[PDB]
From a paper:
The cross-α form was also recently shown by the crystal structure of the antibacterial peptide uperin 3.5 secreted by [name] (Mjoberg’s toadlet), which forms fibrils with amyloid properties. Here, a cryo-EM study of uperin 3.5 in the absence of lipids reveals the presence of β-rich fibril polymorphs, and the atomic details of the cross-β configuration, allowing for a direct comparison to the cross-α fibril and exposing the substantial polymorphism of the same sequence. While the unique morphology of the most abundant polymorph (type I; relative abundance 71%) makes both individual fibrils in the micrographs and two-dimensional class averages easy to identify, variations between the other fibril types are more subtle. We find a propeller-shaped structure with threefold rotational symmetry about the fibril axis, where each of the three asymmetric units per filament layer comprises three chains (labeled A, B, C, along with their symmetry equivalents: A’, A”, etc.) of distinct conformation. An atomic model of the uperin 3.5 peptide built into each asymmetric unit (propeller blades) shows excellent agreement with the data in the inner section of the fibrils, comprising full-length (17 residues) monomers in chain A, and 14 and 7 residues in chains B and C, respectively. Chains A and B are tightly interdigitated and form β-sheets along the fibril axis, both hallmark features of a canonical amyloid cross-β fibril. Chain C is almost perpendicular to the other two. The center of the uperin 3.5 propeller is composed of inward-facing Arg7 and Leu5 residues from chains A, A’ and A”, creating a positively charged and hydrophobic core. In the cross-β fibril, Arg7 on chains A, A’ and A” is buried in the core of the fibril, while on chains B, B’ and B”, it is facing outwards, but with the charge being compensated by interactions with Asp4. Inaccessible charge of Arg7 in the cross-β fibril might support an inactive storage form in contrast to interacting with bacterial membranes.
Supporting this hypothesis, we here determined the fibril structure of two AMPs from amphibians, uperin 3.5 and aurein 3.3, by cryogenic electron microscopy (cryo-EM), revealing amyloid cross-β fibrils of mated β-sheets at atomic resolution. For both of the studied ffAMPs, cryo-EM data unambiguously prove an amyloid cross-β structure comprised of β-sheets with tightly coupled dry interfaces and strands perpendicular to the fibril axis. Despite the dissimilarity in lateral fibril structure and the difference of extended versus kinked β-sheets, the 17-residue ffAMPs uperin 3.5 and aurein 3.3 are remarkably similar in their residue composition. Overall, compared to other amyloids, the sequence content of the two AMPs indicates a dominant apolar and positively charged nature, which fits the functional interactions with negatively charged bacterial membranes.
Numbering used by the authors:
A (entry chain A), B (entry chain J), C (entry chain S), D (entry chain Y), E (entry chain P), F (entry chain G), ...: 1 to 17
J (entry chain Z), K (entry chain Q), L (entry chain H), S (entry chain T), T (entry chain K), U (entry chain B), ...: 4 to 17
M (entry chain a), N (entry chain R), O (entry chain I), P (entry chain U), Q (entry chain L), R (entry chain C), ...: 1 to 7
Write the structure that this text describes.
């Protein structure tokens, strides 16, 4: 819109043994 | 809209043994 | 809208042995 | 000053019929 | 000053019919 | 000053019929 | 961690006459 | 970590007369 | 880490007379 | 009959 | 019958 | 019958 | 609709 | 629609 | 539509 | 260690 | 270690 | 270590 | 004696 | 004695 | 004695 | 009369 | 009379 | 009379 | 003013 | 003003 | 003004 701000942070981990 | 702010943070873990 | 703020934080864990 | 924070949000509406 | 923060958001509407 | 932050957002609407 | 927030503000004064 | 935020502000004064 | 943010602001004054 | 039907609708979501 | 039907619609999403 | 039908539509998304 | 404004 | 404005 | 504006 | 998974 | 996965 | 995966 | 000793350790700090 | 000693260690810091 | 000693270590810092 | 008049002023706004 | 008048002013705005 | 009048002014805006 | 500091 | 500092 | 500093 007008002056909007968006932040996204994602972390994924898969340990298979 | 006008001056909006959005923040998202996600973490996922899968340990399979 | 006008001056809104939103924050989301999520954590998921699955330990399978 | 030191570490201050200020937030202002304003909305005005005028419907004339 | 030192580490200050300021945010302003404004919305104005005029419907004339 | 030192490390200051300023944000301004403005919206204006005029519907004349 | 996930979505954490930390704020610190400090002021020190020493007047010696 | 994931989506973390940190803010620090410091002020020091020494008047010697 | 992932999407981290850090801000530091410092001010020091020494008046000797 | 000058203006048989007149209608106004206003929606403001803020 | 001058203006048989008149209609106005206004939507403002902010 | 001068103006049989008149219509106005306004959409503002901000 | 029908709105009269005179100022 | 039908709007009269005179100023 | 039908809008009259006179200023 | 010793983990058996069958799906 | 010793992990057996069959899917 | 010792990991067996069959899919 | 097939597997004399088996050990698993999992630490999750979030 | 097939596998005398088996060990697993997992550390996740997030 | 097929595999006398087996070891796994995993460290994830995020 | 060595120092007839001495004055000090300190203002700190934080 | 050595120093008839002495004055100091300090203003700190932070 | 050595130093009839002495004055100091300090302004710090931060 | 008149300030004496000795350290 | 008049400030004496000795260190 | 008049400031004496000796260190």
């Amino acid at each position: 819109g007008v002056g909007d701000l968006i932040r996204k942070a994602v972390s994924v981990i898969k340990n298979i043994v």
